[PDB]
Amino acid sequence: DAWDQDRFEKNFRVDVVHMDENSLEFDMVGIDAAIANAFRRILLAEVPTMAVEKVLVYNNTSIVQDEILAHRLGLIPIHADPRLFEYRNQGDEEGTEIDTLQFRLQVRCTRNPHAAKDSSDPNELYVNHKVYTRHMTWIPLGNQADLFPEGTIRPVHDDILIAQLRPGQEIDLLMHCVKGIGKDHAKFSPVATASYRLLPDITLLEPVEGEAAEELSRCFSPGVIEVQEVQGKKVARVANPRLDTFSREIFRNEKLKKVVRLARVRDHYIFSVESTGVLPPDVLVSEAIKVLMGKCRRFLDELDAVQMD
Amino acid sequence: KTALEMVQAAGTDRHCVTFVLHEEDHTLGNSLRYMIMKNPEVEFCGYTTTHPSESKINLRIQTRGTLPAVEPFQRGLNELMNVCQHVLDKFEASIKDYKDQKASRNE
């Protein structure tokens, strides 16, 4: 059958289940797997973010090395909005206001004079012995102090254990954030994991009663089959088939693999978009829908530039 | 510098052409393949990635009934843009109807 656009603008609906900070779970009823997988695969690898690319060390006298520290810094989510920034043009190590950010992680560790008699708890003995990500001074360059408020360019979490120091031991580095997508390197991905699942339908082909309904209620995940009394017998009915983890434990039971028809519902996906905090999950999904459109715009522009006639 | 090549069947046949879409993968070519196969003037629409070390897709569009294969390709691009614009609209109108019940319920 052909593509009736008013059959898609009549049987498509997004039902948001739960949305909070750094998480989202919604439906997409009436969409096939080839567009749903496109949205999933643009959330994971094509929606761009900002992340640390170059590290400029001086006196890393720490046990965490000069290399593993740089890789560990690159995997830190930076809370700059990607859309304000451009791709850094190639072969340009020094950056400008448009392309790069800069931070600075300068932490010395020195012995604590006070509150240290006959103890061994390490917080009482040393100052600056856990280099956390709240130690990153944002060094603004060019004119970025006016575009962004005081305290927006920022690491997302501020509780990430970068290194662990001892007295004498120092970290003095400088960073350069760049823009990239989650296909160049996976430190640029803005999503924890974005994934979909079909909606299950569990159909009782036969009325279950009595001692088999409590057996049926434990073969599924807790929440699916409720067992409530209807005139002396304990009948069972389905209730939230969304909760079912689809573990097929009822097909291990011989008496009750003939009273359920466990299958799925076609084109009734349940997404789940968990952000790493760089962008909220309702702007990641919109900027995942708006990249598939740009991939479709660029090729129509190429065909317009190829044919003149 | 361009990012679409068209490779004819014999230099004369314009029904079969294998579009070489540079800098794509199965994100676009699985959803283009879904839209162009919804066109009844297409005998055959399938795609393959050339080799996973490379970064392009081959897209065979093979049209019956005397059409060039640029028209099912353009119709399947606009007809996917018109899916995504509508999905964007019904998604930005259900996030808003969720924020307007999280807030305006007891606060």
Binding site: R13, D15, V16, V17, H18, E25, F26, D27, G223, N240, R242, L243, D244, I270 | S94, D97, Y98, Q101
Partner: peptide, 8 residues
């Protein structure tokens, strides 16, 4: 797998 609050 909570039931959706923005339903039919």
């Amino acid at each position: 797998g909570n039931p959706p609050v923005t339903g039919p």
